Write an enzyme that holds these catalytic residues in place. Sequence first.
Site, PDB file in Angstrom:
ATOM      1  N   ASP A 263      17.199 -24.927  19.779  1.00 21.55           N
ATOM      2  CA  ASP A 263      16.989 -25.315  21.152  1.00 21.55           C
ATOM      3  C   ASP A 263      16.906 -24.097  21.992  1.00 21.55           C
ATOM      4  O   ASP A 263      17.860 -23.785  22.957  1.00 21.55           O
ATOM      5  CB  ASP A 263      17.751 -26.399  21.478  1.00 21.55           C
ATOM      6  CG  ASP A 263      17.870 -26.965  22.895  1.00 21.55           C
ATOM      7  OD1 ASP A 263      16.942 -27.119  23.629  1.00 21.55           O
ATOM      8  OD2 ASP A 263      18.860 -27.685  23.168  1.00 21.55           O
TER       9      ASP A 263
ATOM     10  N   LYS B 279      14.560 -22.876  24.157  1.00 19.83           N
ATOM     11  CA  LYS B 279      13.858 -23.104  25.272  1.00 19.83           C
ATOM     12  C   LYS B 279      13.183 -21.824  25.872  1.00 19.83           C
ATOM     13  O   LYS B 279      13.529 -20.904  26.881  1.00 19.83           O
ATOM     14  CB  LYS B 279      14.928 -23.338  26.389  1.00 19.83           C
ATOM     15  CG  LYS B 279      15.542 -24.686  26.115  1.00 19.83           C
ATOM     16  CD  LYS B 279      16.307 -25.282  27.029  1.00 19.83           C
ATOM     17  CE  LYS B 279      16.795 -26.922  26.881  1.00 19.83           C
ATOM     18  NZ  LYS B 279      17.333 -27.358  28.215  1.00 19.83           N
TER      19      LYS B 279
ATOM     20  N   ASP C 295       9.307 -17.360  28.732  1.00 16.36           N
ATOM     21  CA  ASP C 295       8.964 -15.982  29.282  1.00 16.36           C
ATOM     22  C   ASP C 295       7.250 -15.983  28.940  1.00 16.36           C
ATOM     23  O   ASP C 295       6.913 -16.813  28.428  1.00 16.36           O
ATOM     24  CB  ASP C 295       9.503 -14.881  28.552  1.00 16.36           C
ATOM     25  CG  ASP C 295      10.038 -13.543  29.251  1.00 16.36           C
ATOM     26  OD1 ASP C 295       8.814 -13.011  29.829  1.00 16.36           O
ATOM     27  OD2 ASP C 295      11.127 -13.118  29.172  1.00 16.36           O
TER      28      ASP C 295
HETATM   29  O1  LIG Z   1      11.844 -11.712  34.194  1.00 15.84           O
HETATM   30  C1  LIG Z   1      10.997 -10.831  33.967  1.00 15.84           C
HETATM   31  O2  LIG Z   1      11.221  -9.689  34.136  1.00 15.84           O
HETATM   32  C2  LIG Z   1       9.604 -11.366  33.671  1.00 15.84           C
HETATM   33  C3  LIG Z   1       9.081 -12.373  34.718  1.00 15.84           C
HETATM   34  C4  LIG Z   1       7.856 -12.551  34.734  1.00 15.84           C
HETATM   35  O3  LIG Z   1       7.193 -13.129  35.658  1.00 15.84           O
HETATM   36  N1  LIG Z   1       6.932 -11.673  34.238  1.00 15.84           N
HETATM   37  C5  LIG Z   1       7.517 -10.889  33.192  1.00 15.84           C
HETATM   38  O4  LIG Z   1       6.515 -10.082  32.569  1.00 15.84           O
HETATM   39  N2  LIG Z   1       8.461 -10.518  32.900  1.00 15.84           N
HETATM   40  C6  LIG Z   1       9.084  -9.760  31.883  1.00 15.84           C
HETATM   41  O5  LIG Z   1       9.122  -8.340  32.415  1.00 15.84           O
HETATM   42  C7  LIG Z   1       8.310  -7.641  31.391  1.00 15.84           C
HETATM   43  C8  LIG Z   1       6.766  -7.302  31.665  1.00 15.84           C
HETATM   44  O6  LIG Z   1       6.663  -6.126  30.694  1.00 15.84           O
HETATM   45  P1  LIG Z   1       5.175  -5.402  30.837  1.00 15.84           P
HETATM   46  O7  LIG Z   1       3.969  -6.621  31.135  1.00 15.84           O
HETATM   47  O8  LIG Z   1       5.029  -4.616  29.579  1.00 15.84           O
HETATM   48  O9  LIG Z   1       4.915  -4.410  31.992  1.00 15.84           O
HETATM   49  C9  LIG Z   1       8.408  -8.265  30.201  1.00 15.84           C
HETATM   50  O10 LIG Z   1       9.733  -7.843  29.559  1.00 15.84           O
HETATM   51  C10 LIG Z   1       8.563  -9.708  30.505  1.00 15.84           C
HETATM   52  O11 LIG Z   1       9.524 -10.493  29.677  1.00 15.84           O
HETATM   53  O1  LIG Z   2      16.406 -29.289  24.610  1.00 17.22           O
HETATM   54  C1  LIG Z   2      17.468 -29.895  24.833  1.00 17.22           C
HETATM   55  O2  LIG Z   2      17.785 -30.342  23.692  1.00 17.22           O
HETATM   56  C2  LIG Z   2      18.089 -30.144  26.185  1.00 17.22           C
HETATM   57  C3  LIG Z   2      17.290 -30.718  27.021  1.00 17.22           C
HETATM   58  C4  LIG Z   2      17.860 -31.180  28.256  1.00 17.22           C
HETATM   59  O3  LIG Z   2      17.013 -31.755  28.862  1.00 17.22           O
HETATM   60  N1  LIG Z   2      19.072 -31.553  28.320  1.00 17.22           N
HETATM   61  C5  LIG Z   2      19.838 -31.246  27.454  1.00 17.22           C
HETATM   62  O4  LIG Z   2      21.134 -31.241  27.279  1.00 17.22           O
HETATM   63  N2  LIG Z   2      19.389 -30.385  26.133  1.00 17.22           N
HETATM   64  C6  LIG Z   2      20.405 -30.026  25.220  1.00 17.22           C
HETATM   65  O5  LIG Z   2      20.748 -31.010  24.506  1.00 17.22           O
HETATM   66  C7  LIG Z   2      22.132 -31.179  24.197  1.00 17.22           C
HETATM   67  C8  LIG Z   2      22.946 -32.086  25.014  1.00 17.22           C
HETATM   68  O6  LIG Z   2      24.369 -32.216  24.703  1.00 17.22           O
HETATM   69  P1  LIG Z   2      25.511 -33.326  25.173  1.00 17.22           P
HETATM   70  O7  LIG Z   2      25.475 -33.404  26.597  1.00 17.22           O
HETATM   71  O8  LIG Z   2      26.642 -32.879  24.546  1.00 17.22           O
HETATM   72  O9  LIG Z   2      25.131 -34.454  24.357  1.00 17.22           O
HETATM   73  C9  LIG Z   2      22.596 -29.736  24.662  1.00 17.22           C
HETATM   74  O10 LIG Z   2      22.809 -28.693  23.647  1.00 17.22           O
HETATM   75  C10 LIG Z   2      21.403 -29.066  25.659  1.00 17.22           C
HETATM   76  O11 LIG Z   2      21.440 -27.740  25.564  1.00 17.22           O
END
Ligand SMILES: O=C(O)c1cc(=O)[nH]c(=O)n1[C@@H]1O[C@H](COP(=O)(O)O)[C@@H](O)[C@H]1O
Ligand SMILES: O=C(O)c1cc(=O)[nH]c(=O)n1[C@@H]1O[C@H](COP(=O)(O)O)[C@@H](O)[C@H]1O
EC number: 2.4.2.10
Lengths: 256, 256
Positions: free
Chosen positions: B89, B91, B94
Amino acid sequence: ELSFGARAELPRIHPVASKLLRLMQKKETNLCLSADVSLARELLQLADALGPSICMLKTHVDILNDFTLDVMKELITLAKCHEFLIFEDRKFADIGNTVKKQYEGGIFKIASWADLVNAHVVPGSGVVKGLQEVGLPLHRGCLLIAEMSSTGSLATGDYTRAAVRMAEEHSEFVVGFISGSRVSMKPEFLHLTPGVQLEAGGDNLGQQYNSPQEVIGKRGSDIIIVGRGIISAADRLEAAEMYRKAAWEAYLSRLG
Amino acid sequence: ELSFGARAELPRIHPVASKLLRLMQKKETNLCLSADVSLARELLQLADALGPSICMLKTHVDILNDFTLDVMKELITLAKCHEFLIFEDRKFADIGNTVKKQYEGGIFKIASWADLVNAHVVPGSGVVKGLQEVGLPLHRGCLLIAEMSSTGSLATGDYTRAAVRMAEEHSEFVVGFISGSRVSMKPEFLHLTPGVQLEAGGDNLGQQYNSPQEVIGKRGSDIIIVGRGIISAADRLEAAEMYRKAAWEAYLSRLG
Ligand SMILES: O=C(O)c1cc(=O)[nH]c(=O)n1[C@@H]1O[C@H](COP(=O)(O)O)[C@@H](O)[C@H]1O
Ligand SMILES: O=C(O)c1cc(=O)[nH]c(=O)n1[C@@H]1O[C@H](COP(=O)(O)O)[C@@H](O)[C@H]1O
């Protein structure tokens, strides 16, 4: 509009934001290096050589093949020496109960070494509440992702407004945004903008680039985040200096 | 409406979805254990004891204090023995270029052991395109987060519709959703619903609970994801059996 040095003194400024704004002014840099490498040795060699040119080094700890906490100790030594913040771009995006554990614990112990982390706002404000319960006691700051550089981003309109409200309601911990532009009218908040290169273009997986002049000068952001524009260059120090000078002059020209 | 066993044979079914649907039918379980523990020994003891009761074990590898790839090897042994899938999980949320590295590499090597991962849709379809470059060659599947269980979730209306479109346009890799309800009318797609407990309530960080009868029976989802409702109980095996029987009968009664 206030200088970075004056913003560092604002009444409602967060201590992490203040520290950052002071070193930006001192060093004449509003460049964040996106250290998107897989080797600890390359991460540390970039941090040491580019440290004087940057206000911040952004990590993705989860792509380091040879991560250890001792690598992060060595990165902190360089951050202290050269005066830059460490920002782990983890993009926390789960329920509050889960993100608190992802931030404090596991192998990475992110909160132990990261001055800044960021979070998506899509789960609702519980994501911030969970992080802040680890981050507040550890004197850390958080950025909320209000806009995204990638093609098809859904972080627009009401979504961006929700991110700004969530930030302005959690100002004890949230110090600013990942955004493409100024999204908050409150000068206490930092705007950091990724998707930056000097040349027009993108990548093969939805990244879109704009120039430092566009994002700092025209769109009113504070800091450019630059990965491949520096990392893929032969001389990463000269590339960092070109990005630093571009972002710094764009900032000066908006002050007047 | 088709049984899990008949859905496993649909022309457009993904192999990972087919494998899951076949073992759900064979074992009479539509329960996913959310193994939200910090100790490898507790993770493995839960996987072994509850394996016969579950179709899937959901991990957060980044909260395991003593993660190693050997722990994952032992979890796979139990998954094969008891017949359940492993769902990390993570998620992913990026840009495509970054998530490909976060999925394949670093210390976790998630793609090497996880049958399923999930992604937020907010960055646009590049997040899926980046993951699928690693996941397709490794015969893996992905779930898109169309709805969230947490208070203030922005995954509603047009956002949920965008998640369904992105899934239905990437069906070679996307096998279903994290959702609170049936969001796709296409029976090839899996619906997995977290935020499930037998009793009404929530947590102190924005989690909201609904019952298995509500989410499987009334809201038409396929699988319940249950963490604390099982993990915090004294007898986790009996708790798992309670949740399994609840979700399974809700499924049967919707089928008629
Ligand atoms: O949170 C971030 O920095 C991020 C947000 C976003 O909107 N877009 C984005 O490119 N990034 C991050 O910023 C960096 C962009 O890298 P370059 O495309 O190589 O310049 C990467 O490490 C992405 O994971
Ligand atoms: O993708 C997930 O499982 C996730 C999505 C979401 O909408 N809400 C959510 O709680 N989860 C995950 O599902 C689990 C819920 O755990 P409990 O609240 O203890 O039953 C956690 O590990 C969360 O990270």
